[PDB]
Design a protein around this nucleic acid. Structure first.
Ligand code: SF4
Lengths: 303, 180, 97
DNA sequence: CTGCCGAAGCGAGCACTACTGTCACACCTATTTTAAGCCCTTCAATCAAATCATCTTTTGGTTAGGATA
DNA sequence: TATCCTAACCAAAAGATGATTTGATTGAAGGGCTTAAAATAGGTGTGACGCTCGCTTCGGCAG
């Protein structure tokens, strides 16, 4: 009788915090067959009396809260189901448009569901990186993901360009300062191979010692800030053992940076106005735009 | 705007017939209606009396037999509309039209005209009893218009001695309007 | 559902008439409270403020002298005693009737 | 063990979705006077149908008014 | 007589005439609000934006 099965399941789940196997139901009373108890469980999952915990000792079952089962009765069956979608999303969350689009549940009821779940301190709405004002709905107790928080650089649905640019310029300022002071030792290139490079922990300690930004400067954050300079063609990279610095930011290793000179001066070609000319394709001796008529060249004669 | 359009073509249309489709209410829509007209200052005619009666009278179900109206209620439309003209013309010159909701006048006239065409058959009826046969909902002022018009017609009735001799009253005056 | 539908002015809906003893309480209120129609609307939960203003507008047409006479015959003010006087006098009116 | 060239097969030009936030102002509070018209209960004032009490004509029927059979 | 016809008219059917009670309609009020004017005041929310020359594909032996 499923009526016996459901009450036994909830009672055993009350006394077993680790969860109960379906075999526990039959161990307490032997007349329960596997099929009927499985049928009862498969709909207790959709009633909020049961949550399934996959484990090696068979599938385990547990109950969460009184209102967890409460907000499945009648039309509220859509409420904790929306919470199931959200708790699957975890710290990332889902937009309003997406929850309507994905679950096909009526948005008019989703409004009530949202307000009640926020009141119960279960979900909260947070603005996201992916679509700015599109608010994700995500678990109240959890801190949201980087795709929602966007770190220290993401601020008020805008990007603090000045903050990252001043970090870039100041970190290269120190990188080139350390490189030049190291080379001023001018004893041996073999020791310059080590002295010229800067530790990511070292420069992070320096830049956070300055405290330019009141928002925290993270370790991997400063490392990625430095990672822009190599692709800016400005710095070099080298990896050593993890014992350097307090962090040792690599598994058994630790990686350094060093300012780099540009290999070649500005070319002759970039001194030619044609190189910079935008209508290059359209300038012809026969064309109405001509070297015999081009203003950029005439003006380039002066300065 | 649709309303004033029809008014330009002297096309008969009444106030609620529009508001029926618009979730509106008398005050809301009338106050607004005044606002645009004074804002635009465009010339627009009034509802001319005889125009609305054609469409109003034609809506009745009195012109054919039906299980709700056997023949004694059935009547010829031409006679009724004529009679209503001969009454409404009195109403205006006797000041009754001016400054009142126009439709109650039509309802009263039609009710009594229909009666007077077969008074022996129709004297026993009433306002609502007549209207619900035509599935028509009636004005409450129609009672006021009725009392007013009977008061008028008895005063006509006394003018003729061969009507005076019958000692006419509310009950009897109806079957002589064809004479008057 | 028909095109004959009537439209006329429904804003004069049937309101509850005023009692003579209720009028007497209204006058002793002018004696006792003043002309604060919101406050009077509170002492008469069955009447709202607009009803008080309409009551004043009706009374002022003929009974201004009684308005003044009540207003000069001042009495100390108590909401609780006021409410008791109302329902007791109303119950007495019903019992007499 | 690469690869050139066979046989089987398909094809076309002619057929006189949205935000979303700001913004500005519509919207309301809140009173005074007009006039007639329009408005719902609600009983007061008035009117109408059906019934009870009773008289009267005929069917039953006698007494007495009257009669054949 | 044994009974009916029918004056007189009782006894009731049935026919029917009138005053009254009971059931229904209604005047006018309660009181309520609208056009139009005068003005200052504030908020907060709403809601603009029929083929047939050309061309394709892959097995069968030479070299
Ligand atoms: S317009 Fe002058 S600069 Fe530009 S491509 Fe022509 S010659 Fe060169």
């Amino acid at each position: 009788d499923p009526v016996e099965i459901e009450n036994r399941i909830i009672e055993l789940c009350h006394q077993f915090p680790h969860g109960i196997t379906d075999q526990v139901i039959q161990n307490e009373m032997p007349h329960i067959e596997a099929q009927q108890r499985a049928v009862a469980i498969n709909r207790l999952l959709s009633m909020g009396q049961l949550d399934l915990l996959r484990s090696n000792t068979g599938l385990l079952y547990r109950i969460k809260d009184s209102q967890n089962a409460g907000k499945m009765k009648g039309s509220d069956n859509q409420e904790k189901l929306v919470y199931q979608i959200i708790e699957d999303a975890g710290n990332k969350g889902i937009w309003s448009r997406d929850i309507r689009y994905k679950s096909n549940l009526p948005l008019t009821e989703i409004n009530k569901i949202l307000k009640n779940l926020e009141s119960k301190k279960l979900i909260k709405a947070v603005k996201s990186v992916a679509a700015s004002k599109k608010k994700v709905y995500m678990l109240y107790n959890l801190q949201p993901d980087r795709s929602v928080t966007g770190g220290a650089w993401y601020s008020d649905q805008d990007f603090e360009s000045e903050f990252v640019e001043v970090l870039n310029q100041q970190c290269f300022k120190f990188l080139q300062s350390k490189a030049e002071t190291a080379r001023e030792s001018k004893q041996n290139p073999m020791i310059q191979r080590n002295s010229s490079f800067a530790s990511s922990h070292e420069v992070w300690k320096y830049i956070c010692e300055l405290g330019i930004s009141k928002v925290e400067l993270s370790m991997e954050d400063i490392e990625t800030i430095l990672n822009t300079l190599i692709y800016d063609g400005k710095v070099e990279m080298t990896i050593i053992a993890a014992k350097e610095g307090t962090v040792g930011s690599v598994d058994g290793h630790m990686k350094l940076y060093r300012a780099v000179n540009p290999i070649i001066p500005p070319t002759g070609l970039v001194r030619a106005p044609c190189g910079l000319c935008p209508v290059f394709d359209d300038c012809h001796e026969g064309g109405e735009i001509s070297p015999s008529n081009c203003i950029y060249m005439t003006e380039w004669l002066e300065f | 705007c649709v309303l004033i359009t029809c008014r330009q073509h002297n096309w008969p249309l009444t106030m609620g017939a529009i508001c029926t489709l618009l979730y509106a209410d008398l005050d809301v829509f009338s106050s607004t209606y005044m606002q645009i007209v004074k804002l635009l200052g465009l010339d627009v005619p009034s509802l001319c009396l005889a125009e609305l009666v054609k469409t109003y009278c034609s809506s009745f179900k009195l012109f054919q037999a039906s299980p709700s109206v056997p023949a004694k209620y059935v009547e010829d439309k031409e006679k009724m509309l004529s009679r209503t003209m001969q009454l409404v013309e009195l109403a205006n010159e006797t000041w009754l039209v001016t400054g009142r909701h126009p439709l109650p006048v039509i309802t009263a006239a039609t009710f009594l005209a229909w009666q007077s065409l077969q008074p022996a058959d129709r004297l026993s009826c009433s306002l609502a009893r007549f209207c619900k046969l035509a599935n028509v909902d009636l004005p409450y002022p129609a009672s006021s218009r009725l009392q007013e018009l009977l008061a008028v017609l008895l005063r006509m009735a006394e003018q003729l001695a061969w009507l005076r001799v019958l000692r006419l009253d509310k009950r009897s005056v109806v079957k002589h309007i064809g004479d008057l | 559902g028909s095109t004959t539908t009537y439209s006329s002015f429904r804003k004069n809906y049937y309101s509850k008439p005023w009692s003579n003893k209720e009028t007497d309480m209204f006058f002793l209120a002018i004696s006792m409270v003043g002309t604060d129609f919101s406050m009077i609307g509170q002492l008469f939960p069955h009447r709202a403020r607009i009803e008080i203003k309409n009551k004043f507008k009706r009374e002022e047409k003929t009974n201004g002298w009684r308005i003044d006479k009540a207003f000069q015959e001042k009495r100390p003010f108590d909401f609780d005693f006021f409410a008791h006087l109302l329902q007791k006098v109303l119950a007495e009116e019903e019992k007499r009737k």
